[PDB]
Amino acid sequence: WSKEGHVMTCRIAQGLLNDEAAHAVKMLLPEYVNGDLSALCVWPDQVRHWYKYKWTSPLHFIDTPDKACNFDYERDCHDQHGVKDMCVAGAIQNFTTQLSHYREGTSDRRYNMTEALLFLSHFMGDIHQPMHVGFTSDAGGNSIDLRWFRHKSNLHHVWDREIILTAAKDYYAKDINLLEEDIEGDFTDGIWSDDLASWRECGNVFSCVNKFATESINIACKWGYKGVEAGETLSDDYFNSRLPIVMKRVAQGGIRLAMLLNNVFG
Amino acid sequence: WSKEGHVMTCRIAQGLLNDEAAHAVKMLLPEYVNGDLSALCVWPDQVRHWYKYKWTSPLHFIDTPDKACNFDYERDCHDQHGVKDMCVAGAIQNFTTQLSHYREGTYNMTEALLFLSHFMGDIHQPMHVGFTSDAGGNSIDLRWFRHKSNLHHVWDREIILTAAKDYYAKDINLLEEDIEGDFTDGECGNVFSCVNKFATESINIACKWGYKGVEAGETLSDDYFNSRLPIVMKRVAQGGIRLAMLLNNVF
Ligand SMILES: *[C@@H]1O[C@H](CO)[C@@H](O[C@@H]2O[C@H](CO)[C@@H](O[C@@H]3O[C@H](CO[C@H]4O[C@H](CO)[C@@H](O)[C@H](O)[C@@H]4O)[C@@H](O)[C@H](O[C@H]4O[C@H](CO)[C@@H](O)[C@H](O)[C@@H]4O)[C@@H]3O)[C@H](O)[C@H]2NC(C)=O)[C@H](O)[C@H]1NC(C)=O
Ligand SMILES: *[C@@H]1O[C@H](CO)[C@@H](O[C@@H]2O[C@H](CO)[C@@H](O[C@@H]3O[C@H](CO[C@H]4O[C@H](CO)[C@@H](O)[C@H](O)[C@@H]4O)[C@@H](O)[C@H](O[C@H]4O[C@H](CO)[C@@H](O)[C@H](O)[C@@H]4O)[C@@H]3O)[C@H](O)[C@H]2NC(C)=O)[C@H](O)[C@H]1NC(C)=O
Ligand SMILES: *[C@@H]1O[C@H](CO)[C@@H](O[C@@H]2O[C@H](CO)[C@@H](O[C@@H]3O[C@H](CO)[C@@H](O)[C@H](O[C@H]4O[C@H](CO)[C@@H](O)[C@H](O)[C@@H]4O)[C@@H]3O)[C@H](O)[C@H]2NC(C)=O)[C@H](O)[C@H]1NC(C)=O
Ligand SMILES: *[C@@H]1O[C@H](CO)[C@@H](O[C@@H]2O[C@H](CO)[C@@H](O)[C@H](O)[C@H]2NC(C)=O)[C@H](O)[C@H]1NC(C)=O
Ligand SMILES: [Cl-]
Ligand SMILES: [Cl-]
Ligand code: NA
Ligand SMILES: [Zn+2]
Ligand SMILES: [Zn+2]
Numbered sequence: 001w002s003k004e005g006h007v008m009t010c011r012i013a014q015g016l017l018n019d020e021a022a023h024a025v026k027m028l029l030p031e032y033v034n035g036d037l038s039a040l041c042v043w044p045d046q047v048r049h050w051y052k053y054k055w056t057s058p059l060h061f062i063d064t065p066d067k068a069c070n071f072d073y074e075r076d077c078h079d080q081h082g083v084k085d086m087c088v089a090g091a092i093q094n095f096t097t098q099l100s101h102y103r104e105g106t107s108d109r110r111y112n113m114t115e116a117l118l119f120l121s122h123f124m125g126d127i128h129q130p131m132h133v134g135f136t137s138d139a140g141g142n143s144i145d146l147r148w149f150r151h152k153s154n155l156h157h158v159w160d161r162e163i164i165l166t167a168a169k170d171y172y173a174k175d176i177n178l179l180e181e182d183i184e185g186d187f188t189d190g191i192w193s194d195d196l197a198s199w200r201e202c203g204n205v206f207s208c209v210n211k212f213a214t215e216s217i218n219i220a221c222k223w224g225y226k227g228v229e230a231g232e233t234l235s236d237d238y239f240n241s242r243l244p245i246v247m248k249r250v251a252q253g254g255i256r257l258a259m260l261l262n263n264v265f266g
Numbered sequence: 267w268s269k270e271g272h273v274m275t276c277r278i279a280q281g282l283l284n285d286e287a288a289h290a291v292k293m294l295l296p297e298y299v300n301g302d303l304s305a306l307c308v309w310p311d312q313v314r315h316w317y318k319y320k321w322t323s324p325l326h327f328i329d330t331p332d333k334a335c336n337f338d339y340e341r342d343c344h345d346q347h348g349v350k351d352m353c354v355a356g357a358i359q360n361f362t363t364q365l366s367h368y369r370e371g372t373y374n375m376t377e378a379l380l381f382l383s384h385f386m387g388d389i390h391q392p393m394h395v396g397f398t399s400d401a402g403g404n405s406i407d408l409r410w411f412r413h414k415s416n417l418h419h420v421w422d423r424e425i426i427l428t429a430a431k432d433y434y435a436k437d438i439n440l441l442e443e444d445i446e447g448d449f450t451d452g453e454c455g456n457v458f459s460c461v462n463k464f465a466t467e468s469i470n471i472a473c474k475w476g477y478k479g480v481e482a483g484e485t486l487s488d489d490y491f492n493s494r495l496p497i498v499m500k501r502v503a504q505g506g507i508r509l510a511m512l513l514n515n516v517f
């Protein structure tokens with residue numbers, strides 16, 4: 001996601017933390033964000049360019065083969081040079097494990113738990129963004145130039161940001177907090193209120209990340225790539241049919257991130 | 267150490283405490299641990315990740331120059347940016363001094379105790395006083411029997427867990443009681459020289475027994491376990507005896 005998908009994913013998660021998770025997160029954050037996890041959830045997108053963290057660059061996405069329309073861990077979860085686990089599914093296992101050590105203390109210098117938290121948070125959002133688990137050849141739609149309403153864009157960015165911005169502008173006065181509260185409502189009192197247990201119950205971590213990836217690639221083929229040709233214009237119909245899917249994936253990432261943090265600390 | 271080495275170090279100390287040091291420790295500890303210091307001496311390993319206590323991070327160890335195979339306080343006792351005393355040797359002195367003010371009433375004393383007890387353990391862990399380029403073995407990746415591990419972790423935990431499961435039905439308490447009995451049945455000038463000695467013992471062991479024979483990517487099993495185990499038990503005992511020493515003098 002661009003900034004807004006991450007901020008929403010993480011504010012939703014933070015307001016659903018249990019007391020032990022809430023506390024750990026508060027202790028792990030710098031004083032300057034005043035307890036707000038969401039103030040830092042886009043941090044990995046900035047630092048992936050830093051030499052020190054260039055190893056984090058393939059952890060943002062999954063490349064699945066063109067047209068295959070499924071996800072297979074062994075086949076897909078590696079960077080370009082075939083190094084194992086270097087995809088957003090592997091990243092989530094990794095940093096979830098690191099955080100499980102914090103609780104007992106039993107770890108050493110190799111791991112920085114503030115970075116473990118921010119990475120896990122970020123990457124739980126990214127795996128929920130369908131176009132982050134899209135095709136290898138178009139790099140999750142980045143190569144597919146197109147027009148979003150009146151301006152130039154690409155299919156990846158339509159999912160990372162344009163759909164979110166158009167919704168914010170059209171219905172919520174450009175105020176992401178209000179879009180976020182609508183998403184809260186839809187899972188507190190609304191259309192998704194009876195699905196939270198099913199969203200939360202995905203087996204062990206390895207099993208959860210396969211399920212999140214699968215959902216993502218599945219949506220990429222059915223809703224992302226589908227109906228979209230390079231150079232064409234996407235407007236009302238595509239927005240109207242896809243906004244609910246974007247909103248849902250923002251919700252699911254928040255709930256599931258809350259779920260991991262609650263299990264790893266509590 | 268990981269948790270079990272700290273808990274053992276601290277239980278062995280509390281039972282060697284004179285009446286003044288014991289009463290001190292009871293008054294500084296929170297209601298909820300019911301007088302059990304060991305219940306809280308892994309605390310520094312949690313709080314080192316907290317923003318509020320970032321500065322405690324380098325106090326867990328000492329990085330000595332690769333192959334040098336010796337310790338020197340002015341050469342070594344600093345963080346990665348040169349700030350002096352920011353090493354486990356510096357921290358033990360720091361927190362000794364702080365606790366000297368507890369009786370007089372003349373700094374948070376609960377924290378000083380927990381940091382002291384913890385760090386007296388860590389200085390005794392040989393690999394907390396190892397080389398700088400592999401971070402005290404942390405980046406020497408290997409196998410401990412079947413398990414993916416690293417050399418640093420072999421000493422923090424693997425050797426202790428493996429002796430626990432093998433000889434004590436996984437019960438740390440029985441292993442402790444056997445270290446207590448074996449190394450309690452038969453002093454330095456100041457605290458500065460005390461910590462120098464502890465630190466030098468640990469660097470020596472690291473060279474002779476930690477790093478020696480160990481190849482990256484290789485499996486350590488019965489031979490390395492059998493031979494190093496009694497070195498690990500000694501260090502646990504030494505740590506706990508000497509920590510009782512300091513607490514006894516300061517209180
Ligand atoms: C000198 O230094 C020490 C350590 O840095 C400080 O002591 C800490 O002080 C805080 C209070 O500010 C303590 O934190 C609190 O501990 C309570 C104790 O409960 C324990 O036992 C129950 C079961 O009986 C467990 O369930 C629980 O997890 C604890 O292990 C907690 O009940 C408190 O919880 C409340 O606050 C937190 C966060 O604010 C919320 O998440 C909770 O919902 C709840 O509202 C709290 O966690 C801490 O234990 C102390 N640590 C130690 C090592 O003693 C001293 O305060 C400091 N001295 C001075 C003068 O400032
Ligand atoms: C575990 O990992 C985390 C994350 O990697 C580390 O946390 C970072 O620690 C550094 C300290 O090295 C923090 O960097 C400093 O942050 C200060 C505050 O930044 C905020 O406010 C400023 C302006 O008011 C904004 O510009 C900024 O966006 C922030 O909102 C700054 O004051 C510092 O900047 C100045 O000093 C440095 C020199 O230290 C110069 O290089 C700079 O150019 C500048 O002049 C500085 O950047 C950083 O914010 C922390 N990040 C996070 C996410 O927490 C932990 O330290 C690490 N733990 C261990 C043990 O290593
Ligand atoms: C002895 O114990 C005492 C605690 O009782 C302990 O004092 C602490 O020392 C640290 C230094 O490591 C102090 O933290 C510093 O705060 C000042 C501002 O007042 C800053 O100058 C320092 O900035 C550094 O760290 C920044 C944050 O990451 C970096 O951005 C920057 O580059 C600097 O490197 C640093 O934050 C801490 O506040 C005191 N606390 C108290 C209560 O005095 C002391 O370190 C102990 N020493 C040993 C050897 O055990
Ligand atoms: C698990 O997290 C750690 C960071 O704590 C990563 O460790 C790095 O691994 C790469 C190998 O690709 C090395 O180049 C770096 O030097 C390592 N850094 C450290 C600090 O150990 C590791 O890549 C992570 N794995 C996954 C799948 O996320
Ligand atoms: Cl940073
Ligand atoms: Cl605490
Ligand atoms: Na030096
Ligand atoms: Zn993103
Ligand atoms: Zn993206």
Ligand SMILES: [Zn+2]
Pocket residue numbers: 001044045060122126
């Ligand atoms: Zn990202």
Ligand SMILES: [Zn+2]
Pocket residue numbers: 267268272387388391
């Ligand atoms: Zn330790």
Ligand SMILES: [Zn+2]
Pocket residue numbers: 107108267268394418422
């Ligand atoms: Zn260690």
Ligand SMILES: [Zn+2]
Pocket residue numbers: 267310311326384388
């Ligand atoms: Zn430690």
